[PDB]
Symmetry: C2
Subunit: 94 residues, 2 copies
């Protein structure tokens, strides 16, 4: 009755390495499946998908060191990530 | 006057570098806007967002060299990307 969580599902979604062995189209079927367990059109609407995806680019837009700090906590929401980094940009050392 | 288009919107969205000077939450506002110009709940539905976002991760799941090729052409559709990468992996490099 519990769900893994959208953030956990997204982690699995990105933990997926592109493997030529399964073929890119078949890999898509995996990614599509994994992203679907994260986005979930069934329960989430389009604007919520925006939020999740904003977070997505935002994290990778961060420098490796700041990004690692996020990745070491995993907020799952863009503004939370923003708040993590908001302090990290205040002279690296926190 | 028009929208950049979902394909170009993702470009602007991915070309966005995190700049501490604009702040993460202000950057979010830009990203939230850019991703919205890409996903567009206004015109598109959730499953379209699934697809666009599968593409997004699929490209990053690819190795830097293969990813660079996709990034240089920009299909915008996951299966289309799957098609070039399937070719790029034919005799690693093409």
């Amino acid at each position: 009755g519990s769900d893994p969580g959208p953030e956990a599902a997204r982690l699995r979604f990105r933990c997926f390495h592109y493997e030529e062995a399964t073929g890119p189209q078949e890999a898509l079927a995996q990614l599509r499946e994994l992203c679907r367990q994260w986005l979930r059109p069934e329960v989430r609407s389009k604007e919520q998908m925006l939020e999740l995806l904003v977070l997505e680019q935002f994290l990778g837009a961060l420098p490796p060191e700041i990004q690692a700090r996020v990745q070491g906590q995993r907020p799952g929401s863009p503004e939370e990530a923003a708040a993590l980094v908001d302090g990290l940009r205040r002279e690296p050392g926190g």
